[PDB]
Design a protein around this nucleic acid. Structure first.
Ligand SMILES: [Mg+2]
Length: 644
RNA sequence: AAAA
């Protein structure tokens, strides 16, 4: 009777019920009754016999709109001495016909101006609605304006909140905080930061010491909880955002205002900074022996980029730093190699595969797509952050403190069987493990025995699909791909609300519990599930916003390459055609089913192939193809290919 | 899937 609408292909879709089974009903376009993608609706099952698979339904009323504002392009034209207004919504799932309120239209608003509009009224029976312009965003051809519109359509806040900035600008460095008995003075240690070249939020610094029996690792994380009081205005805004947002052009929407993100909580060189340290001692094989968590004070001696460290590694450059930094980095790389070997021994799933970024010019127009490369410096930092995250998760669990975990379940036997069949057609080995009990180690060994297969890329793509998304949970579930029974996010409280919450839990229960009330502790405990829920729901939106922006920028880039031939492989097959991932740009283009040459092709959902009725020719995931870019679909932001 |  109640559920969330999702619109898909041709603006038909389905409703996922709120009942305990999450029962799914199909809904055709004609039974939507004015409802839009993501709306909460009241629905009824259709009296129809079941066509199969699922029941069908019709929307009765809209209980809550998913959005109040919608992006679109505003058009104005004059015809028989009268102004006519039209809006084209950016979102192809916005299917309602719009009547534009003339009193919402400024006299100076020109044609082809991006706007945001709201729905004033709608007629569910005719799919007609009255809308008013609520914001003027800018030139509709401007790619940065489009990126901002795409954030608005995904409910992603990006405008500066002046109240929050003013609250932040009051904050200052308390010089006496370093003298607190609970805060360890580590200002003499050769901490440094290692980050991408354009990052200005330095949340994490590392220092590694060698001892006779092994190593001691210090991971120092900006002490964000010490500056951001829970339920302060700054906190509430961070909780709404849930995370910093990173889109192309190094365009960042920070979770926290820049007085925190780039000054008080940024571990900038030669500045005294307050941190939370995860300190771990290792033996000479990289096995963890002991750990300690505590507030501290550091002075980073150097900020480095991945590029700088990597060139140093390959003896193609020197680092202009003190010898203590040089020895710490050398020990960090040695330790990092050892940690990586232990984690592989215990079981971990390295799901690395091809990644790209879009290069844009100073006006945010896309220039080209670059493939990213494995990064020795980036990998070292990754190993160190992972071991800290895992250790903090276990410390909180060992002390029986409820926390939000980062979790990732074992996939079902069913989904594994499907994956094994698909990749077996690409000469990927059939695995030997039990499908009910398969461990992280066994998936890793299976990946490793196929590393040289030409189809390794789509193998990892499909494995990732099989495994599904990681998410946050207070329930103590495993992280299958990291390979731990307990994992959380601790190292990045400048950009992630979960890490900020993890730091608050450390403060309130382990660092200075005497300074907090039992209610504060229970209140936060009671709120943890809802925090995880909001972060999980917003993470969906962020990923969708990145997808929208990627498709917008890449199809704009490709719009100048019509007629060009691209080689690639099939990444997906649907009832409407073949998705071919192009080698040169890693982007999926659509080959429409109806115009594939030489035969009439039928979608078979079981093996998810297209099979020709006369010739038995088969298209399957992984096949190598060549195709011509024939058009850009600017409505759906798709690249359409035709087989050549 | 992980890492800033
Ligand atoms: Mg960092």
């Amino acid at each position: 009777l109640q559920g969330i609408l999702t619109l898909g292909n041709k603006n038909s879709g389905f409703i996922r019920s709120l009942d305990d089974d999450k029962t799914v009903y199909y809904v055709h376009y004609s039974n939507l009754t004015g409802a839009l993608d993501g709306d909460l609706v009241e629905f009824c099952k259709l009296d129809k016999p079941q066509f199969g698979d699922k029941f069908d339904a019709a929307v009765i009323t809209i209980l809550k709109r998913a959005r109040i504002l919608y992006a679109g392009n505003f058009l104005v034209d004059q015809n028989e001495f009268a102004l006519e207004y039209k809006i084209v919504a950016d979102n192809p799932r916005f299917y309602l016909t719009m009547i534009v309120n003339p009193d919402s239209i400024p006299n100076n608003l020109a044609s082809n101006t991006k706007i945001a509009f709201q729905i004033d009224e709608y007629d569910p029976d005719n799919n007609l609605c009255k809308v008013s312009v609520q914001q003027v965003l800018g030139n509709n051809d401007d790619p940065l304006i489009n990126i901002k519109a795409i954030m608005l359509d995904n409910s992603i806040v990006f405008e500066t909140n002046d109240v929050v900035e003013q609250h932040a600008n009051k904050l200052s460095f308390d010089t006496e905080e370093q003298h607190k008995a609970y805060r360890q003075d580590l200002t003499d240690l050769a901490f440094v930061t290692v980050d991408p070249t354009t990052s200005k939020d330095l949340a994490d610094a590392i220092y590694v010491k060698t001892i006779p029996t092994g190593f001691v690792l210090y991971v120092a994380i900006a002490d964000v909880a010490h500056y951001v009081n829970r339920n302060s205005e700054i906190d509430i805004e961070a909780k709404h955002k849930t995370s910093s947002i990173y889109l192309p052009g190094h365009y960042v929407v920070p979770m926290l205002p820049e007085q925190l993100s780039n000054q008080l909580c940024s571990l900038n060189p030669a500045q005294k900074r307050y941190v939370v340290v995860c300190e771990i001692s290792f033996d000479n094989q990289g096995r963890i022996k002991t750990n300690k968590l505590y507030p501290a004070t550091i002075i980073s001696k150097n900020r480095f980029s991945y590029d700088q460290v990597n060139k140093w590694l390959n003896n193609k450059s020197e680092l202009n730093c003190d010898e203590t930094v040089i020895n710490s980095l050398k020990a960090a790389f040695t330790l990092s190699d050892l940690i990586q070997a232990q984690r592989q021994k215990r079981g971990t799933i390295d799901l690395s595969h091809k990644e790209t970024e879009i290069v844009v010019d100073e006006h945010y127009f896309p220039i080209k797509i670059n493939f990213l490369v494995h990064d020795k410096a980036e990998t070292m930092i990754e190993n160190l952050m992972v071991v800290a995250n895992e250790t903090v998760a276990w410390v909180l669990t060992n002390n029986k403190i409820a926390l939000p975990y980062r979790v990732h379940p074992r996939p079902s036997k069913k989904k594994l069987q499907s994956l094994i069949e698909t990749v077996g057609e690409l000469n990927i080995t059939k695995p030997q493990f039990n499908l009910d009990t398969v461990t992280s180690s066994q998936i890793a060994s299976w990946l490793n025995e196929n590393k040289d297969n030409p189809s390794y890329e789509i193998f990892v793509i499909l494995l990732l699909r099989t495994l599904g998304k990681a998410f946050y949970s207070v329930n103590p579930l495993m992280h299958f791909s990291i390979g731990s029974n307990h994992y959380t996010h601790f190292t990045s409280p400048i950009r992630r609300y979960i890490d900020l919450t993890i730091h608050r839990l450390l403060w309130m229960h382990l660092f200075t519990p005497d300074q907090f009330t039992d209610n504060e502790r229970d209140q936060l405990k009671q709120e943890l599930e809802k925090i995880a829920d909001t972060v999980n729901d917003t993470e969906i939106k962020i990923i969708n916003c990145e997808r929208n922006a990627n498709d917008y920028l890449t199809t704009l880039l490709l719009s100048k390459q019509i007629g060009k031939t691209f080689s690639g492989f099939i990444s997906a097959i649907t009832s409407f055609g073949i998705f071919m991932r192009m080698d040169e740009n890693n982007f999926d283009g659509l080959i429409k089913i109806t115009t594939i040459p030489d035969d009439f092709f039928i979608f078979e959902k079981e093996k998810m192939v297209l099979k020709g009725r006369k010739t038995n020719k088969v298209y399957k995931i992984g096949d190598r193809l060549e195709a011509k870019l024939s058009e850009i679909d600017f409505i759906q932001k798709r690249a359409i290919l035709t087989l050549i």
